[PDB]
């Protein structure tokens, strides 16, 4: 059924699973028209499909041409997402196909179930976790490839860089969710924390800086403080 804090270690077992977040698929800027009405302009988006055990991220870039001449785009976006995830699953060798797909928003359940009727053994599940995957577009290299795309495109990343050489996937997922929650709550500050020190760089083949174990503990502490700080600023505590 639904995924929550009780069955949290299930994410890191040896059953292949993917998270699917559709929150950046249909993206718009709202603006005024010459006549003083309001209109939207779509910008490029992405599906965020992540294996939490391996860090493998299948970033399907959604080019603005897919909505050309289409109505009810928000409803369309969940189906576009469903269609792309289904196409991705079918593209994978059988032994790499997921056993479970966890959607971060319950409105994805029916579209994905419908797309996955051919795969009755693949469980489609919601989650009671509030996962900060919407903040994926705050990762500079991911935002860059989405905005530069001139056509539909799939880009593969490991969202954990090389962390799994030193930490478990539970710890790597916890680090990722803390970083993304911080970027979601105060992007400017979080980025400042991540790059304040010019001697720690991001390798060309990585997303995040090359922190040592000790430095990661410092960074993680600073991100918690940021989240707590914003929580206070928000609620006046």
């Amino acid at each position: 059924g639904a995924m929550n804090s009780s069955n949290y270690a299930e994410l890191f077992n040896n059953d292949i699973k993917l998270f699917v977040d559709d929150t950046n698929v249909y993206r718009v800027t709202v603006h005024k028209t010459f006549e003083g009405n309001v209109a939207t302009k779509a910008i490029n988006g992405c599906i965020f499909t992540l294996n939490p055990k391996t860090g493998h991220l299948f970033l399907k870039i959604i080019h603005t041409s897919v909505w050309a001449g289409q109505k009810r785009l928000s409803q369309l976006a969940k189906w576009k997402t469903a269609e792309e995830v289904s196409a991705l699953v079918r593209s994978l060798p059988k032994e790499e196909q997921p056993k479970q797909i966890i959607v971060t928003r319950k409105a994805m359940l029916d579209p994905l179930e419908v797309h996955m009727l051919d795969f009755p053994n693949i469980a489609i599940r919601p989650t009671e976790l509030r996962l900060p995957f919407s903040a994926a577009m705050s990762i500079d290299k991911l935002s860059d490839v989405v905005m530069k795309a001139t056509e539909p495109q799939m880009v593969l990343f490991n969202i954990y860089d090389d962390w799994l050489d030193r930490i478990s996937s539970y710890t790597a997922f916890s680090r990722l969710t803390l970083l993304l929650r911080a970027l979601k709550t105060n992007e400017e500050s979080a980025k400042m924390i991540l790059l304040s020190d010019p001697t720690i760089t991001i390798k060309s083949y990585h997303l995040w800086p090359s922190f040592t174990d000790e430095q990661w503990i410092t960074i993680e502490s600073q991100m918690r403080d940021l989240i707590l700080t914003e929580y206070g600023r928000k609620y006046n505590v």
């Binding site: 409803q75 369309l76 189906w79 469903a82 269609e83 029916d110 579209p111 179930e113 419908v114 797309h115 009727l117 051919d118």
Partner: protein, 300 residues
């Protein structure tokens, strides 16, 4: 006008005949029901006074044979049987009528209720949903499950309604995943009407039969089936105009007939609110929407 005689009434029982019902006391001199209108299916149903558990009954059509009811003390129920000896049957009925031991089917002349509930219901189609080929009549009770219910357990005692499932490969074409799930017209018109039912009359017949089993037996799987067949129509953007008009009439008489005190269990709030207020056909069921709003405004 035809007759269903009873051998006797050895146990106290409420007897239903179509939408009518009456009480028979233990060992009361009751020998059946006369003046049954020819031309329609009928249902004679039973609820024992000492065990309201298990409503049960028999669908039959007097044009297909001479039927009577006899209590079986071993199996503990009123059973329908066929009498093959026509002369014997006529003589039995004539005697019971002369002794005025029968209740008269109490049809008001103005009253088209039963016709309107059974307009498309045929015995031949009943006998394919209820499989017991050695009999010309069909037994149904409160507890019988449907073929779909069993897939989600005795197959011989099942209700073989047409399986409707909106998230099934049958309902959803390769490349029209969104179109077929948000607009069920393909599934209604090509798969069900053209493919399985052949015409809307057979579809409405199953719909009406499902409602009647839900109402008269409290049969839960029948209620599920009735609501599924309504929803499939209401959720199709493309439905023949004559079907929508006929559906409105069918549902009107079903809602009109439903016992007020059984509305809570026989009517699915989600389906009805969706069908009347959100679906493609939300504005096509004028009569049904008006009786629902005046009779069950709570449900909505």
């Amino acid at each position: 006008m035809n007759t269903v005689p009873f051998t006797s009434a050895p146990i106290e029982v409420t007897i239903g005949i179509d939408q009518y019902s009456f009480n028979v006391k233990e060992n009361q001199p009751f020998h059946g029901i006369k003046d049954i209108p020819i031309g329609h299916v009928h249902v004679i149903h039973f609820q024992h006074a000492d065990n309201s558990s298990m409503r049960y009954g028999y669908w039959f059509d007097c044009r297909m044979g001479n039927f009577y009811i006899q209590y079986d003390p071993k199996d503990g129920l009123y059973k329908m049987m066929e009498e093959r000896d026509g002369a014997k049957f006529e003589n039995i009925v004539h005697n019971f009528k002369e002794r005025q031991m029968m209740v008269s089917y109490p049809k008001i002349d103005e009253d088209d209720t039963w016709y309107n509930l059974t307009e498309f219901v045929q015995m031949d189609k009943i006998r394919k949903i209820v499989r017991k080929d050695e009999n010309q009549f069909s037994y149904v009770d409160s507890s019988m499950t449907t073929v779909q219910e069993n897939e989600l357990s005795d197959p011989a005692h099942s209700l073989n309604y047409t399986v409707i499932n909106f998230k099934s490969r049958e309902a959803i074409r390769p490349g029209h995943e969104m179109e077929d799930f948000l607009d069920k017209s393909y599934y209604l018109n090509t798969v069900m009407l053209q493919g399985i039912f052949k015409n809307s009359s057979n579809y409405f017949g199953e719909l009406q039969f499902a409602f009647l089993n839900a109402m008269f037996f409290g049969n839960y799987g029948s209620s599920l089936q009735w609501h599924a067949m309504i929803e499939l129509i209401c959720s199709s953007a493309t439905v023949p105009k004559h079907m929508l008009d006929k559906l409105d009439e069918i549902l009107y008489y079903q809602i009109k007939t439903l016992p007020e005190q059984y509305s809570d269990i026989l009517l699915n709030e989600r389906v009805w609110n969706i069908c009347l207020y959100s679906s493609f056909q939300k504005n096509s069921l004028h009569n049904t929407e008006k009786i629902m709003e005046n009779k069950y405004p709570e449900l909505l």
